[PDB]
């Protein structure tokens, strides 16, 4: 810790604060997550407990690398490889012109790949959103921020008081399902895909019920034909207004046929029919894939 030299703050983790720092001996530039230990209060927080334990196992090109952990009695430091910004910031800095279609396709592909390595190592991210996705000037993108990720060697139960985002939440979670599934990361990534392509949030709702209805009004009200189980689900209601499926052509204008197809399989109401990160990579959408760099 005396080897690192702090350069400037660059944001704040669900828990702790992130600096850009530099190794004064190797010259490497790093992101330093600095976490205050209330040694009297509650100990090492559980967001850190999880992010460290799972990131230490997940070594892969599209997952942010945890380089070193530094433990002193007062402070706990998490040293990450440095990445130049988040997709959210790139998106706001990039509306009115738009992220090039084939930058989008390389990003989704790159994310579905780490997502796939995550899922094959029994790890659910559980909080995918553009703010948690990091990109560098060479056009890599990587899944960052794992404070809510959980190991699913055993199923993972839902916070009946959710503490876990709105705009990118799955209908099955919004309707009060007892467990999470890998299916929930796929939903979010489909939403980020739609968001990258249309420059705005696919389902930007204001309350749990508003959200359900924003999903329903674009994709249609689910029914047992489409999603066997829905009617008997703990928060489902016969009083639900009953809309019809809109035209994915009219949800995602600038998208070719191949794209609307993948988008629509990432956005299935049924967790069991929804595409896997593994399958999605096989989708034809991904043939002409390259590796553009962004204009940062």
């Amino acid at each position: 810790m005396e080897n690192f030299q702090k350069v400037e703050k660059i944001g704040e983790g669900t828990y702790g604060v992130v600096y850009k720092a530099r190794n004064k001996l190797t010259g490497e530039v790093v992101a330093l997550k600095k976490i205050r230990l209330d040694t009297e209060t509650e100990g090492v927080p559980s967001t850190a407990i999880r992010e460290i334990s799972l990131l230490k196992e997940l070594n892969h090109p599209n997952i942010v690398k945890l380089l070193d952990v530094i433990h002193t009695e007062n402070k706990l430091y998490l040293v990450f490889e440095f990445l130049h910004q988040d997709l959210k910031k790139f998106m706001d800095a990039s509306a009115l012109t738009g992220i090039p279609l084939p930058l989008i396709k390389s990003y989704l592909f790159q994310l579905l790949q780490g997502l796939a390595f995550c899922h094959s190592h029994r790890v659910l991210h559980r909080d995918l959103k553009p703010q948690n996705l990091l990109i560098n000037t060479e056009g890599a993108i990587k899944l960052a921020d794992f404070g809510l990720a959980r190991a699913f060697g055993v199923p993972v139960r839902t916070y009946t008081h959710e503490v876990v985002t709105l705009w990118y939440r799955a209908p099955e979670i919004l309707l009060g399902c007892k467990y999470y599934s890998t299916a929930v990361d796929i939903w979010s990534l489909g939403c980020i895909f739609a968001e990258m392509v249309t420059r705005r949030a696919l389902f930007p709702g204001d309350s749990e019920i508003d959200q359900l209805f924003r999903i329903f009004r674009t994709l249609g009200t689910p029914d047992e034909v489409v999603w066997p189980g829905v009617t008997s689900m703990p928060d489902y209601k016969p009083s639900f207004p009953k809309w019809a499926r809109q035209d994915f052509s009219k949800v995602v204008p600038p998208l070719d046929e191949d794209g609307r197809s993948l988008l629509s399989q990432m956005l299935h109401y049924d967790p069991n029919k929804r595409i896997s990160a593994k399958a999605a990579l096989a989708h034809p959408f991904f043939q002409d894939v390259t590796k553009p760099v962004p204009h940062l």
């Binding site: 230990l37 040694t39 009297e40 509650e42 100990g43 090492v44 927080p45 559980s46 407990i49 999880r50 460290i52 334990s53 799972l54 230490k56 196992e57 952990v69 433990h71 009695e73 899922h119 094959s120 190592h121 029994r122 190991a151 060697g153 055993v154 199923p155 139960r157 916070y159 890998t182 896997s276 990160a277 593994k278 399958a279």
Partner: protein, 258 residues
């Protein structure tokens, strides 16, 4: 039928060799013994019942204790503190809301200060190098349970119970991998409730034949049988409750049939 069940199962299988505690570590602890261990674990069973923690939490807690005692010498005075620390860690990692450090101190009848407890949390995280995502017998049983026909609530509840029995005595169980004990437990319970046996899907999925499961079935059958005798009885009072169908009451078979 995920795209992953198999890679995960394989991975978990790989992972468990990494996370294995030293087999003969209690014989080099100069001040504690398997029986003190048995006392410690039976306590955690209850502490789990009282705060209504999940059963995975308990498997995580015992794995940590075993890895920690596997390379640190601990006096019989400080062992409970190590157990509390480990139940705290496992809590934070597996539970949606853990009990607060305060409650963890309370359940030791204010015997350590909450600063001692917090500082042992830290010492455990160091010794295990933040490696808390260990596979467990409960993890492998859940996987194995996907390959049953028809699903039986009663085999499940009983299989879990037997797996928890193995948590208590470090001899002989530290010799076997969790994947193997889940094996034994799955078959023993399945046998016990139905007379059926370790299926072939599992044999082909796991590569364990009923044969290779044998030596561990011997021990789990012996525990099952001496079950009401045992100096410790929290796992039996636990699984008497009917959230579990009262399986602990059902009658062990006197003979395995191999």
């Amino acid at each position: 039928v995920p795209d992953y069940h198999e890679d995960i199962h394989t991975y978990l299988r790989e992972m468990e060799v990494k996370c294995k505690p030293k087999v003969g570590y209690m014989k080099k602890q100069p001040d504690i013994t398997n029986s003190m261990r048995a006392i410690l674990v039976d306590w955690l069973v209850e502490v789990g019942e009282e705060y209504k923690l999940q059963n995975e939490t308990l498997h995580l807690a015992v794995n940590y204790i075993d890895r920690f005692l596997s390379s640190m010498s601990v006096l019989r005075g400080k062992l409970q503190l190590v157990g509390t620390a480990a139940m705290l860690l496992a809590s934070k990692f597996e539970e949606i809301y853990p009990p607060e450090v305060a409650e963890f101190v309370y359940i030791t009848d204010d015997t350590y200060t909450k600063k001692q407890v917090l500082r042992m949390e830290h010492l455990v995280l160091k010794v295990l190098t933040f490696d808390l995502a260990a596979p467990t017998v409960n993890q492998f049983l859940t996987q194995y349970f996907l390959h049953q026909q028809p699903a039986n609530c009663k085999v499940e509840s009983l299989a879990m119970f037997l797996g928890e029995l193995s948590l208590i005595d470090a001899d002989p169980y530290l010799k076997y991998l969790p994947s193997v004990i889940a094996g034994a437990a799955f078959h023993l319970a399945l046998y016990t409730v139905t007379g059926q046996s370790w299926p072939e899907s599992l044999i082909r999925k796991t590569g364990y034949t009923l044969e290779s499961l044998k030596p561990c079935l011997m021990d789990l059958h012996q525990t099952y049988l001496k079950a009401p005798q045992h100096a410790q009885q929290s796992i039996r009072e636990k699984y008497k409750n009917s959230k579990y169908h009262g399986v602990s009451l059902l009658n062990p078979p006197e003979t395995l049939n191999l």
